[PDB]
Amino acid sequence: GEFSVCDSVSVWVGDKTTATDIKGKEVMVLGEVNINNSVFKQYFFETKCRDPNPVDSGCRGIDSKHWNSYCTTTHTFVKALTMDGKQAAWRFIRIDTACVCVLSRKT
Amino acid sequence: GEFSVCDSVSVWVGDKTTATDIKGKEVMVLGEVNINNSVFKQYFFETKCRDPNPVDSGCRGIDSKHWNSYCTTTHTFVKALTMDGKQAAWRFIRIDTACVCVLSRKT
Ligand SMILES: [Zn+2]
Ligand SMILES: [Zn+2]
Ligand SMILES: [Zn+2]
Ligand SMILES: [Zn+2]
């Protein structure tokens, strides 16, 4: 019976308005898009950690004798129609994509 | 000095042509896109595992006494302009997003 070191959760989001852009800034995500000559809504598949606790580690199954650990949300980058001044831009926004375990060795 | 259980690698790809779609099928990814009234190329941020070996685990730092492990590439889903019959479709394709460690307990 298989499973991963950090438990994650994934959801589709379609009510997105605010996002952080590729170099750290906040931007506004528009509701709809016009690609080719069709109108589409903007969707996003996000994965967060369940237990990001940075003291009672959410990492399962570690050599805790030699190793410290926690669960962390990593990010990918997708393009989205945002708002630049006030005509739109196609820009890369950062989104939660996964939950990985991070280590450091003990003194 | 911090690091993660599985070593990953991330690259930008802009020469994508073939992809696997949301329910397992192959599709063709077009080179360019027309969003709003502007022409853009399609980009993708991909992350794979470095050591997906499923015998000498690439997972660092495990209670190997009680636990088996390997590194695996997980996937997210982004929309892209593909080719449906032969006018285009805005569809969700699967892309490598991250490298997580998977466990199973020992007999
Ligand atoms: Zn809303
Ligand atoms: Zn804000
Ligand atoms: Zn090429
Ligand atoms: Zn093919």
A7 CA → ligand 2 middle, Å: 28
Answer yes or no: do B34 and A36 touch at CB < 8 A: yes
CA nearest A95: which of A56, A53, A34, A43?
A43
Q: What is the DSSP-derived secondary structure letter of residue A12?
A: E
CATH: 3.90.850.10, 2.60.40.10, 2.10.90.10, 3.30.830.10. Which one for A1-107? 2.10.90.10
Task: Determine the Cα–Cα distance for residues A42 and B34; give it in Å rounded to an integer.
Answer: 15
- Could you tell me if A4 and B71 are in contact, meaning their C-beta atoms sit under 8 angstroms apart? no
Task: Identify from A5, A13, A62, A91 which residue to disrupt to test chain B contact, counting B C-beta atoms within 10 A and taking the largest count.
Answer: A5
Residue A84: partners with Cβ closer than 8 Å, 6 or more residues away:
A27, A91
Structure tokens at B78: 């982004």
Give B60's contacts in chain A (Cβ within 8 Å): 103
**Across the strands, what pairs with A21?**
A93
The domain ranges of chain A are 1-107
Beta strands in chain B (DSSP E): 3-4, 8-13, 18-21, 26-28, 32-35, 38-41, 44-49, 67-84, 87-105
Structural method: X-ray
What amino acid occupies position B64? Answer: S
- Whether A100 and chain B come into contact, CB under 8 Å, resolves to yes
Q: Would you tell me which residues 12-51 of chain B have a C-beta closer than 8 angstroms to some C-beta of chain A? A: 33-38, 40, 43, 45, 47
Q: Residue A90 CA to chain centroid, in angstroms? A: 19
A16 CA → ligand 1 middle, Å: 7
CB pairs under 8 A between A and B: 116
Question: Has A15 been labeled as part of a binding site?
Answer: yes
- Tell me the backbone φ, ψ of residue A46, rounded to 5 degrees: -115, 140
Task: Determine the Cα–Cα distance for residues A11 and A34; give it in Å rounded to an integer.
Answer: 24
CA nearest B71: which of A103, A101, A33?
A101
Task: Determine the Cα–Cα distance for residues B31 and B17; give it in Å rounded to an integer.
Answer: 7
Residue with tokens 């690091």: B3
Task: Determine the Cα–Cα distance for residues A4 and B74; give it in Å rounded to an integer.
Answer: 11
- Could you tell me if B57 and B71 are in contact, meaning their C-beta atoms sit under 8 angstroms apart? yes
Residue A57: partners with Cβ closer than 8 Å, 6 or more residues away:
A64, A68, A69, A70, A71, A101
What is the C-alpha end-to-end distance of chain A, expressed in Å?
Answer: 34
